[PDB]
Nucleic acid binder design. Structure first.
Ligand SMILES: [Mg+2]
Ligand SMILES: [Mg+2]
Ligand SMILES: [Zn+2]
Ligand SMILES: [Zn+2]
Ligand SMILES: [Zn+2]
Ligand SMILES: [Zn+2]
Ligand SMILES: [Zn+2]
Ligand SMILES: [Zn+2]
Lengths: 105, 105
DNA sequence: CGACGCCCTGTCGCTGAGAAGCGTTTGCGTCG
DNA sequence: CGACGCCCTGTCGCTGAGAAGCGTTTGCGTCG
């Protein structure tokens, strides 16, 4: 698949309690799905757990999506706090992402 | 147009005398054509004058295309020398491009 | 290196991906 | 700032562009 997936900014008002209930706690408990899942930028795993929504208009693609364990262990932030933050920008947007590809550059 | 144009490596044996005869000398003498023309990376002008062919396999798109005046005035190299060089890499490939966008980063 | 044990329960490799060009576009300077 | 003159004959702005995910993928260490 060549082209870049769209990036949609979800307001904090549109975040539902069901989405917060589905924030992954342990990476071994993830459920893989090629259709309904979403891909975390850190671990590069496409799973159905709730992931962070980057709210920077300049942000693009799926770089802003992070899972529970990855955001917690690699950046000390909670996905639930990130989803409820109207001004939350992804670590790639802030230029502090430590994934195997971004730290390489 | 969203997607990236292909990059084709032309061996020095395939360079013809007609192509060398069409290397631009003065940027004011260029002929614009949206169909048959090619775009220089430095001046960002799509014209029909012969342009450099970057021979790095890792190179992609049309970043390696430079016109006569731009390569001469901005990098001190001749397009004819570049086209006849089997190991010629574009200034973006060498990370020394001084166009308005690359020097900005 | 893949079995087990520990506490802070965890993450890299490969492929193919990585714009392009039309429009407000061309060096320097006195000078009206 | 857009006419003119100079020699080394020239280049920036805007838009939309800027992957994604399956596969060889999960912290630390003694130890067989
Ligand atoms: Mg490629
Ligand atoms: Mg865009
Ligand atoms: Zn993750
Ligand atoms: Zn972002
Ligand atoms: Zn990253
Ligand atoms: Zn040019
Ligand atoms: Zn190149
Ligand atoms: Zn450049």
């Amino acid at each position: 698949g060549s082209v870049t997936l769209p990036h949609i900014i979800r307001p904090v008002e549109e975040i539902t309690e069901e989405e917060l209930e589905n924030v992954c706690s342990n990476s071994r408990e993830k459920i893989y799905n090629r259709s309904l899942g979403s891909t975390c930028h850190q671990c590069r795993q496409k799973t159905i757990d709730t992931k962070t929504n980057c709210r920077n208009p300049d942000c693009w693609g799926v770089r802003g999506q992070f899972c529970g364990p990855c955001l917690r262990n690699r950046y000390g932030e909670e996905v639930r706090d990130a989803l409820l933050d109207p001004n939350w920008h992804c670590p790639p947007c802030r230029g502090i992402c430590n994934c195997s590809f971004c730290r390489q550059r």
